[PDB]
Design a protein around this ligand. Structure first.
Ligand SMILES: [Zn+2]
Ligand SMILES: [Zn+2]
Length: 88
């Protein structure tokens, strides 16, 4: 009732760790979020940096290597785009 002011500062988007002299702050390329050297210790081709193996966060590093198999997103193109194995 008489409270509601949290002090959320620059933290990690993986462990929620606060960036300090000891814990430096890192940035992702794929998701584009803030991570700690600990979490941001992976590299994977990012379709944003021209498909270059940039330092990405664990998640992304896995998401880019997992290759989702769904179509949950804004208007999607027709399974058949260009003459090829183009999947749905
Ligand atoms: Zn972290
Ligand atoms: Zn990321």
């Amino acid at each position: 009732g008489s409270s509601g002011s949290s002090g959320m500062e620059s933290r990690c988007y993986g462990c929620a760790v606060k960036f300090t002299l000891f814990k430096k702050e890192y940035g992702c390329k794929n998701c584009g979020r803030a991570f700690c050297n600990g979490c941001l210790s992976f590299s994977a081709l990012v379709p944003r940096a021209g498909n270059t193996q940039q330092k990405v966060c664990k998640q992304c590093h896995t998401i880019l290597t997992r290759g989702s198999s769904d179509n949950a997103s804004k208007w999607s193109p027709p399974q058949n785009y260009k003459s090829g194995p183009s999947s749905g």
